[PDB]
């Protein structure tokens, strides 16, 4: 849209003496370019290295235009405290770096210089104090600066690709075919560095959501990016489109789906402990994402990279800030989608989505309950793949639990399979939340009856509407009359459970604990 003009005017009008004001307007412009879709002429402008150019003015402050969101912010912070004459009350171990980044960006997003100049310099001073005195922050800045220095010729070469030799990336939803090959995404090693690096081309026209996410703690689950810049590409149209090109390390253990398959051949006692180790990361990522008022509508195993045994996300294009979107406003995978989303689609022979129905015009998803369902289906896919070579055709059937594909199921598999059924109920308001799931993961070693009781304390069954049929099920089991004498008394309760429109798993499963005693 090319809106940076009045900020360029204010920068030029700013006195040469006031270099905090100069840097404020450079960081304000940079924050807006990340939100703006490029046209051809704005591409030349952000790539102008001559005097008067945007690149040349950033070199005067030693700010690298191709740096990650984090390193570019700390480079702004270093330039700003060079100009500070009013030293704040410094206390390093009483400061959240993510909170300072969020407060800085809110200023750059919509605040004038006259109303925030002091706090803006103060915030950047604190950021720079961690860069110098905090071992963790200093090492991050040192590693990214050094890699950025080594890949500098590759960035120049990529940017210098011929206007008639740009790659053309066809789009496709399947991940079963592989990653498309272009000139930019070949692995490579560098001077003395051991891990191979790779560039990727994200399928978007701006990085507005990406900019906001990197100031939140949820970004710990992002593949560390070392360089970000926008690049010219060619579509099937033959017109010049613009996509971000990002540098990072190559993830050395593929994704979570392949991790689950590898366990099929290993020791069985390791399955449930390792599912715990991986899903403690997925659960923490989900809650931390939800805290930013952002949501992930395409949660599935092969969408999470594994690297040095760490679960990480790199495909963030599907994230939304809308906690109640229409089905047409989010992108997801049908095989793992909740039923309230599948009811907004029209299907063909054999059942492929082809469009939306009239439900899509008004029906809205609850994203936290949406994510809870998909996290449950991810757990069901992980469990089943340690036993089968491919997913069974009844995979979406909730009456077929993950444990029903185990020949020798342990108590932990029994307990995890129960959590799958708790997260994937039809009614979104009756699904176990991700928070309750987090609380229960630590009790997976309990005996199944004891673990069942733990779920009842976390998520009381009176909140499913089934409180009447529950007490009517324990009326007969608490009585000490067993044998065929109980079945006659336990018959009228077996009737009410056979009329339920979808089987409620808590009742179905406790009626089994009644039929065991009658027989």
């Amino acid at each position: 849209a090319k809106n940076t003009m009045p900020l360029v005017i204010a920068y030029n009008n700013a006195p040469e003496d006031d270099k905090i004001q100069k840097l404020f307007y450079l960081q304000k412009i940079n924050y807006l370019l990340n939100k703006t879709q490029l046209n051809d002429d704005l591409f030349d402008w952000i790539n102008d290295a001559e005097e008067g150019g945007w690149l040349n003015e950033l070199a005067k402050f030693s700010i690298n235009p191709n740096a990650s969101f984090f390193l570019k912010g700390m480079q702004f912070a270093k330039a700003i405290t060079e100009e500070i004459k009013n030293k704040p009350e410094i206390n390093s171990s009483e400061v959240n770096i993510y909170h300072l980044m969020q407060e800085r960006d809110q200023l750059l997003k919509e605040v004038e210089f006259e109303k925030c100049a002091t706090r803006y310099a103060e915030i950047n001073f604190l950021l720079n104090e961690l860069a110098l005195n905090d071992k963790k922050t200093k090492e991050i800045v040192e590693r990214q600066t050094e890699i950025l220095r080594l890949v500098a010729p590759k960035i120049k070469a990529i940017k210098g690709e011929s206007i008639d030799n740009l790659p053309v990336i066809p789009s496709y939803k399947t991940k079963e075919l592989g990653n498309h090959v272009n000139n930019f995404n070949f692995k490579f090693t560098m001077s003395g560095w051991e891990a191979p690096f790779v560039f990727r081309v994200e399928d978007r026209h701006e990085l507005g959501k990406e900019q906001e996410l990197h100031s939140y703690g949820v970004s710990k689950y992002f593949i560390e990016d070392y360089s970000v810049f926008m690049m010219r590409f060619k579509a099937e149209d033959g017109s010049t489109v613009y996509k971000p090109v990002i540098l990072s390390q190559f993830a050395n253990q593929n994704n979570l789906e392949e991790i689950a398959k590898q366990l099929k051949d290993g020791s069985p006692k390791n399955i449930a402990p390792r599912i715990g180790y991986y899903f403690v990361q997925l659960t923490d990522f989900c809650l931390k994402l939800i805290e930013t008022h952002n949501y992930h509508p395409d949660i599935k195993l092969n969408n999470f990279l594994v690297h040095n045994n760490r679960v990480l996300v790199s495909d963030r294009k599907t994230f939304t800030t809308n906690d109640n979107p229409l089905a047409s406003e989010i992108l997801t995978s049908p095989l793992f989608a909740p039923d309230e989303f599948l009811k907004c689609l029209l299907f063909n022979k054999e059942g492929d989505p082809v469009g939306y129905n009239r439900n899509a015009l008004w029906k809205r998803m609850n994203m936290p309950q949406f994510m809870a369902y998909q996290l449950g289906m991810a757990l069901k896919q992980f469990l089943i793949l340690t036993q089968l070579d491919e997913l069974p055709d009844d995979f979406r059937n909730p009456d077929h639990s993950a444990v029903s594909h185990f020949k020798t199921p342990s108590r932990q598999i029994i307990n995890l399979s129960l959590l799958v059924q708790e997260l994937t109920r039809l009614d979104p308001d009756k699904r176990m939340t991700i928070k309750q799931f987090q609380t229960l993961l630590n009790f997976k070693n309990l005996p199944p009856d004891a673990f069942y009781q733990k779920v009842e304390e976390v998520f009381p069954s009176s909140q499913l509407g089934i409180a009447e049929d529950i007490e009517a099920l324990n009326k007969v089991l608490n009585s000490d009359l067993k044998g065929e004498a109980l079945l006659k008394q336990a018959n009228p309760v077996f009737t009410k459970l056979s009329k339920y429109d979808p089987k409620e798993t808590r009742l179905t499963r406790l009626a089994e604990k009644l039929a065991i005693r009658c027989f």
Binding site: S93, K135, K136, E139, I140, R143, E194, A195, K220, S267, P268, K269, N270, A272, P273, R274, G276, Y277, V280, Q281, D284, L287, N308, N309, R310, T408, S410, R411, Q412, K435, Q438, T439, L440, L441, N442, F443, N445, L446, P447, A450
Partner: protein, 183 residues
């Protein structure tokens, strides 16, 4: 902050002996759990733990560890941390994969010496935590996994404390951190 933890259920309750449960079974299932956790956590930093960085397996300059061989008769071995820890991981997994010691079937009882075998496992599991904290916490921070590491150690040391399975003198390399979490 670097003493952070993750959300979870009450870990002190999570390690309590459930009612009517056999203590050996309770020790067995949680030992298998903790081994996999520390085995996964060590895999995150394995490229930073090398022959050059850790010539002597240790928990800092004062806590040098030697390896007591279970098959050969020889004075305990002074070796590197990468050699020691991958010695240890295959050894523990061999124990858990032995139906004689960790019976998974119903009709197979625990051996008379199961407790001693499990407490030797739990002692050596502790030494991988102590080596990671003392010598590789900078690599832990660079991968932003302080909270997961601390939470796993918290779960592990609460279970040890609950049933008193490691001697206090062996917990010495992390005494300051232990009393920090349990308060």
């Amino acid at each position: 902050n670097a003493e952070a933890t993750l959300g979870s259920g009450n870990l002190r309750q999570a390690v309590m002996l459930p009612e009517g449960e056999d203590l050996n079974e309770w020790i067995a299932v949680n030992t298998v759990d903790f081994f996999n956790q520390i085995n996964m956590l060590y895999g995150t930093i394995t490229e930073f733990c090398t022959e050059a960085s850790c010539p002597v397996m240790s928990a800092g300059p004062r806590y040098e560890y030697h390896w007591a061989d279970g098959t050969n008769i020889k004075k305990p071995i002074k070796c590197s941390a990468p050699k020691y820890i991958d010695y240890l991981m295959t050894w523990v997994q061999d124990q858990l994969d032995d139906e004689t010691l960790f019976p998974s079937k119903i009709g197979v009882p625990f051996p008379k010496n199961f407790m001693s075998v499990a407490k030797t496992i739990l002692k050596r599991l502790f030494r991988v935590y102590a080596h990671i904290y003392h010598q590789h916490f900078d690599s832990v921070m660079q991968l932003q996994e302080e909270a997961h590491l601390n939470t796993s150690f918290k779960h592990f040391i609460f279970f040890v404390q609950e049933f008193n399975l490691i001697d206090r003198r062996e917990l010495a390399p992390l005494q300051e951190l232990i009393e920090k979490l349990g308060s």
